Each structure stands twice: as C-alpha cells, then as structure tokens.
Amino acid sequence: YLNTYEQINKVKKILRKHLKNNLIGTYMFGSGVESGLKPNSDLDFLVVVSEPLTDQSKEILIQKIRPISKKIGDKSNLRYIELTIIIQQEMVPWNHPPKQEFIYGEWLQELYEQGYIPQKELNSDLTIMLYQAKRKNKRIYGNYDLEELLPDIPFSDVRRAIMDSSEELIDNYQDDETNSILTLCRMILTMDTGKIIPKDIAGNAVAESSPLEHRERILLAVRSYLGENIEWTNENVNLTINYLNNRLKK
Ligand SMILES: CN[C@@H]1[C@H](O)[C@H](NC)[C@H]2O[C@@]3(O)C(=O)C[C@@H](C)O[C@H]3O[C@@H]2[C@H]1O
C-alpha cells in the first residue's frame, strides 16, 4: 500500500498542487525529526501560507489527505498525519495565543465526515509547536527556513502556553488517558530545563521522580503508546493527572 516515504511525498505534492503560490514553505517537526524517526512516530507537518484559505480550499485538503493518513484503529504500518497551516502575516506582531488557519488531525475525523471544515481559530497549543519547530525542523519545500518566517517567540509565552493547555487538559483527560499523562510530564520538563522531549522518555523521567501510585500509572501509559493494549477504565488516572498538574504549577 503506502510506506512513510510515499506519505511524505503525497503530502508534499498535495500542498504544492492545491495551494499554488500561496504556499511559502512546508516543514516537519515533532518527535519525527527530534530524537529520530522511529517506526512508531507520527508525521507532524507545518505549513506556512500567505493568504487565507476559503472553506472549500480547506475542504479539498481534508479530502485528499484523508486516504494518505492512518486511522486510529488501523493496525498497520501507516502513521498519523498531523498538519497545521499558519499565515505569516497573522504571526507578526507576535501575540499569545497565536492564530491558526487550518488543522488536519485524525481525532477530528468524526467531525470531518459530518461536514466540519476547520476554520480560523486561536490555538494556545500552537505556541509550543512553533517554539520547538523553530528549533528543530526539516524543510521539505520552500525558499526560506522556518526561523526567518516567524518572529522571536519569547520563553515567557511558552511557559504560559504550557500551563494554559495544562488546565485545559485536566478537564478533558477522559478517553485520552494514555496521551495526556505523558504530555503533562513533557511539559514538566519543558518548563524546568527547557527541553522538549518525546513523550516516550518524558514519562519515564518523571516516573521514578514521583510517588509509586503515580509511578505505576506513568509507566502504564509508557506501554500503551507502544501498542500494548491497556484498558484505563478501572485505573484511577484522576489522581495522577491531578498530581502532574500540581507538580507543574510553579
Ligand atoms: C496536541 N493536539 C492533539 C490533541 O491533543 C488530540 N486530542 C484529542 C490528541 O489525540 C491523540 O491522543 C489521539 O488519541 C489521536 C492521535 C491521532 O493524536 C493523539 O494526539 C493528539 C494531539 O496531537
């Protein structure tokens, strides 16, 4: 069917074909460029455009990227494709939270079938994305590197972007237990040392640095992201999520 080289290229060509010269650059970030592209990692694309997309231009992007990506239940070699589109002019003057023009994500697929087209939205998670992408990124198209397309984002805004998304996360940990546990730990480290680390090894770092009760649940979420079917319905994630939330507060 498709391997990851084909995935990189069809996504690369879908964007130059259906956005023409509105496309300034397309970049890859996340744990695929950071700490190596393991066969388990996800494909996080970042796309910079000049002018806004009209809803149907955002709709063909959904429909053509749709078969290219891995569905949540897919027990195959395909990996998730997460692409966010930002507009360069909507980025200066810098201001948290930043503006976002488009987003593809497979957690939004149930909404995609019902007719949802991601429209202009303010996302605070985007602040840490651009911060870690300005640092380490792989450019697959464009005449400029990502760092000359975004202003210097201050570390004062990531620290609040960390915590703004923190207490957004404490409310809706439900049904995303495995991922939200490891994300908070990555945020504990990103705001203590300043390094953004894969959630795989971010969990084990705080694991042995935390009480046993939460230690067990941190390591249980280490496995479930590596496959390893784990049913959280009787584990008390509320306690560990409450613990990591307060440990981050500083
Ligand atoms: C940070 N943005 C998203 C967002 O938090 C999603 N929440 C529904 C989150 O969802 C996941 O945990 C999923 O279960 C689905 C997967 C494609 O993305 C994973 O990472 C997804 C994150 O990348």
UniProtKB/Swiss-Prot annotation:
InterPro entries: AadA_C, NT_sf, Polymerase_NTP_transf_dom. It catalyses: spectinomycin + ATP = 9-O-adenylylspectinomycin + diphosphate. Transmembrane segments: none annotated. Keywords: Antibiotic resistance, ATP-binding, Nucleotide-binding, Nucleotidyltransferase, Plasmid, Transferase. One of its GO terms (molecular function) is ATP binding. GO terms for biological process: response to antibiotic. The keyword DNA damage does not apply. Mediates bacterial resistance to the antibiotic spectinomycin but not streptomycin. This is Spectinomycin 9-adenylyltransferase.
